[PDB]
């Protein structure tokens, strides 16, 4: 869709560092890689 075309890596990284506060680069990297690893199959995630 048109509204999601401004979605970026860095606002998602600021969202993960907003809600989790990992206090490390590697833990934020592992949580961002886990959150991008969950959404890799498009059939398996249904967003309501």
């Amino acid at each position: 869709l048109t509204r999601f075309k401004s979605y970026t890596i860095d606002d998602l990284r600021q969202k993960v560092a907003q809600t989790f506060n990992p206090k490390s680069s590697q833990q934020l990297t592992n949580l961002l890689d886990s959150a991008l690893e969950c959404v890799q199959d498009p059939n398996l995630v249904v967003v309501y």
């Binding site: 075309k5 890596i9 990297t29 961002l32 991008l36 890799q40």
Partner: protein, 284 residues
């Protein structure tokens, strides 16, 4: 705004535990002592070779580095090898033992290790790309640029994702090497008569993206991997839709993935993704 913040001088430092070495630890060094342009008088690296490389297989060089001509194409067992680097200064050889020295900086470990060949391990990488399209058919666009999908395999060594590619065979060119690595690792052929013809029509157009030193953990001071990246772009997407991905040989699972700036891959493959999104003018 930030202050005295340096965006540069981020040299690659390998981890001190070597992979699959059984707890063998290399010499821990700082990032300023990584390149050989810096002095580092207290740098005492260890010398380690793997016991699979010490049993002398068919894909490995012998254990004496004497009478081996580097920076030129050499004939080993009647087979052509490249044996040259992409460095501008070139590969240097230590005259005390005959072993070469890596021009891209010291890694804190000597010998060959898990790498079979002395000097430059020449690798070829296969990046097969298609456009990320909708179910309606429109190409997906993020941040004012188009969005690419690429085939990624999962390695059996480190249990994490990488691009398809591998080391060069003796007596073979890079177009045979990248095609055999994409057939064995990504496609799983070996270990169709129309899908193979569509795969040959996909493989008929291949452009060289980059030729860069790998940031691998397996690189020692006398053995280092330099690779060449071949891109196979399907602009129509009809050839990429007929490829059935199945993991084989040195790969566990192979699937399509979306390229982005926060990718977590093996070694320096994000630089190759930045080069192929610079070449095909896509999102990064």
């Amino acid at each position: 705004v930030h202050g005295h913040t340096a965006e540069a001088a981020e040299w690659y430092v390998p981890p001190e535990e070597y992979p699959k070495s059984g707890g063998v630890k290399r010499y821990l060094i700082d990032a300023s002592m990584v390149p050989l342009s810096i002095m580092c008088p207290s740098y005492d690296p260890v010398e380690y070779t793997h016991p699979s490389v010490a049993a002398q297989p068919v894909w490995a060089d012998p254990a004496d580095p004497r009478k081996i001509k580097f920076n030129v194409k050499d004939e080993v067992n009647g087979k052509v090898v490249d044996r040259t680097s992409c460095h501008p200064s070139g590969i240097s050889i230590d005259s005390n033992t005959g072993r070469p020295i890596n021009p891209w900086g010291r890694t804190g470990m000597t010998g060959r290790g898990l790498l079979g060949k002395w000097g430059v391990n020449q690798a070829a990488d296969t990046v097969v790309t298609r456009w990320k399209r909708s179910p309606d058919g429109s190409i997906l666009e993020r941040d004012g640029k188009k969005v690419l999908e690429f085939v990624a395999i999962q390695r059996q060594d480190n249990k994490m994702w990488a691009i398809p590619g591998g080391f060069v065979d003796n007596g073979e060119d890079v177009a045979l090497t990248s095609g055999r690595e994409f057939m064995e690792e990504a496609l799983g052929m070996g270990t169709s008569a129309e899908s193979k013809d569509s795969l040959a029509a996909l493989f008929s157009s291949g452009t060289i993206v980059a030729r860069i030193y790998c940031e691998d953990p397996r690189n020692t001071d006398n053995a280092w991997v330099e690779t060449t990246c071949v891109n196979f772009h399907d602009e129509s997407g009809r050839h990429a839709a007929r490829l059935k991905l199945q993991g084989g040989d040195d790969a566990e699972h192979a699937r399509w993935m979306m390229v982005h700036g926060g990718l977590n891959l093996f070694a320096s493959h994000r630089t190759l993704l930045q080069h192929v999104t610079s070449a095909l003018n896509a999102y990064f």
